[PDB]
């Protein structure tokens, strides 16, 4: 017995994604490759955001990612900032940005 | 005492793939789970709408590929489509 995630080479669950697609009332039928594609895309996005978050965490001399690191990662990357533009991250804070005219 | 499905273990696996040394807190894991659920809902809804517009009764790899192209910005969309097509090709090859 070999899982579909193992066959596709991904870490995210293809079977769970297929069940969610079937039970979510998106269409009468769900294709075989649709869960694989969706799991791959989700894994890629998670990998990107986690790579940026870990890079932020190392800069703060901390090993564990806290929500502030995720906020810094999302806001510093323009594409992820556009993707999560209307999203508020709890305990995320804001980027340090003081306007030039206010400086002495 | 009831099952609560979550992407915690998968997010941890991906994190270990990217950063073998770093870890993640409970709030950060909850945020990541919410992010995965939100992106899943976005792509699934866009795919369902695409299928409805073309009078198709199924969600295929084409629908999700178009949904990813519509949702994600440029480089993100290109790399995501590359990853998805690699995954589907490997899945078909493994049969």
């Amino acid at each position: 017995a070999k899982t579909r995630s193992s066959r596709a080479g991904l870490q995210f669950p293809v079977g769970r994604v297929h069940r969610l697609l079937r039970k979510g009332n998106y269409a009468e039928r769900v294709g075989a490759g649709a869960p694989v594609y969706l799991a791959a895309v989700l894994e890629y996005l998670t990998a990107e955001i986690l790579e940026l978050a870990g890079n932020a965490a190392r800069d703060n001399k901390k090993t564990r990612i806290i929500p502030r690191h995720l906020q810094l990662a999302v806001r510093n990357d323009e594409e992820l900032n556009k993707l999560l533009g209307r999203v508020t991250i709890a305990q995320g804070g804001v980027l340090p940005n003081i306007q030039s005219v206010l400086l002495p | 005492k009831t099952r609560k499905e979550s992407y915690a273990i998968y997010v941890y696996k991906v994190l270990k793939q990217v950063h073998p040394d770093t870890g993640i807190s409970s709030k950060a894991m909850s945020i990541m789970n919410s992010f995965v659920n939100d992106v899943f809902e976005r792509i699934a809804g866009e795919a369902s709408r695409l299928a409805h517009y073309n009078k198709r009764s199924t969600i295929t790899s084409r629908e999700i590929q178009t949904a990813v192209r519509l949702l994600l910005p440029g480089e993100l969309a290109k790399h995501a489509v590359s990853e998805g097509t690699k995954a589907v090709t490997k899945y078909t090859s493994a049969k």
Binding site: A47, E48, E51 | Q17, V18, P20, E75, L76, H79
Partner: peptide, 8 residues
Amino acid sequence: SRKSMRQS
């Protein structure tokens, strides 16, 4: 062990 071509 995993690297993304977007940053590189």
